[PDB]
Design a protein around this ligand. Sequence first.
Ligand SMILES: Nc1c(O)cccc1C(=O)O
Ligand SMILES: Nc1c(O)cccc1C(=O)O
Lengths: 278, 279
Amino acid sequence: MHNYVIIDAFASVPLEGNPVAVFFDADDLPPAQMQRIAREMNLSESTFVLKPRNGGDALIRIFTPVNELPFAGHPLLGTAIALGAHTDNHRLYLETQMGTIAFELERQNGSVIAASMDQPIPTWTALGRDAELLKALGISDSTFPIEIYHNGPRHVFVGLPSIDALSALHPDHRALSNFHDMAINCFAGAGRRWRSRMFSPAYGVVEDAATGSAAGPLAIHLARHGQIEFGQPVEILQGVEIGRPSLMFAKAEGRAEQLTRVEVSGNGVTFGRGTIVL
Amino acid sequence: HMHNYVIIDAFASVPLEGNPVAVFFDADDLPPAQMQRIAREMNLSESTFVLKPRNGGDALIRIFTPVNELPFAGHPLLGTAIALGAHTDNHRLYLETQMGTIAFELERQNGSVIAASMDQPIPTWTALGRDAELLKALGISDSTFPIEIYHNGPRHVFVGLPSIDALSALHPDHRALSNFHDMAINCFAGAGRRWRSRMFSPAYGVVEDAATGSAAGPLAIHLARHGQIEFGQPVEILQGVEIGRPSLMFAKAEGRAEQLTRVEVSGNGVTFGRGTIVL
Ligand SMILES: Nc1c(O)cccc1C(=O)O
Ligand SMILES: Nc1c(O)cccc1C(=O)O
């Protein structure tokens, strides 16, 4: 039997943010069973905590309902918050398929409130499928060039001219399914405050509440396109329209040609705790 | 305030098959607005909330999809009956709903409730009359049977496919189906005692559902009305194969079209997990 907790990542109260089911003591489970368990939970991701193999504190495997990912932001944030209960550490190193991810935990009286991670530095290129993607999204143009970023998963960014226009999107889920191994992140905002919506048939979700591995790339994207400075922290509010408001904090330090750090942080809270029969 | 829950895989006899439902106990203190938000948190096809009875039943059950309340549903109530069956030695359980009281017969084996049978509300039905729209959303040109919509609380449309291969090949347009409000689209194929189904319902917050128990009774009626089976003939309906959640629903509809006397749906169910939440 395995214990799990349900963490609402990128939230300061239960029922906000983005849930992740974190399964402990998972070294006995084959990956095909981890995948089926993720399918059972039907959350954007479930994670599995394994003994470390390369000097971290734990090795974490991350599954959507349909596929394994090599890195993901909300699932790891929630995993770090949940594991932080195990010990008194304030620095935590979590192994993934993209390498070891460093976390700093915000604790009060030993109790974990939030965490900050140093993400993989993404690479990027032009999508080159603009007409097709804009048609699928139901819009004419992006406000900025349409580029795809890779940090394990892949994230495409499409800019909208207002928050109302963002909220008005009704994408064609089936047309989006022709965009394999990527998530589509639509953004709008100004200055230090941005809104997002994410859609990804490829990762098993019509609309995700908080796509943490997109937050770092968005900060880069906004700085590369002159809307914020490199190093300027931004707030990215995702999931509003679906009733799952999620507050992601991001900062990308360096310059376009040489990034030094991509920090994403958030609060997270426990929604529940239990045990599965396998 | 805190609440215990179980996860039942309905219409399955092993965990990770069937259709999960989260059943929350002692839920009277949750306003419906919070029950709705908890159903979205769980993100299963439904969560249920067990409330004290008001009309002579054992409990009153409220049923939520990730996006709306339903007055009746089959897999969620099967799972709720199995979960509550753990708490009693009784053979029968009476679950009050917005559609009235639903009677369950519980099947036990070596001290565990392993299955249950329900008598569903007798549905009404009519032709849908939106065939070109619906067939275009599904990506097909016609139905093997008249396209009819049944109501037993929720609503279920049935579209017939000429082979299981044709059913498995469907890739419906989720957005186009969202114009079909307050209903589920159930596509079926098979013969005799053995049928396959797939269900799609943006209205009820699901791209594709693994086991639509409130569609099982209506499908048995549909098949008898259209000459494919006899009234009273038990059928096996296998749903959810293509999404990796095979679910076996057993259904029988007794009487004749002008007067059905019983619409029975049964299945196995098993506990996947259990826990407690912070509100
Ligand atoms: N939540 C995510 C998802 O649904 C797909 C891909 C990535 C994430 C994430 O949190 O990074
Ligand atoms: N599972 C169901 C769903 O997803 C929508 C409506 C009804 C049901 C059901 O099990 O009856």
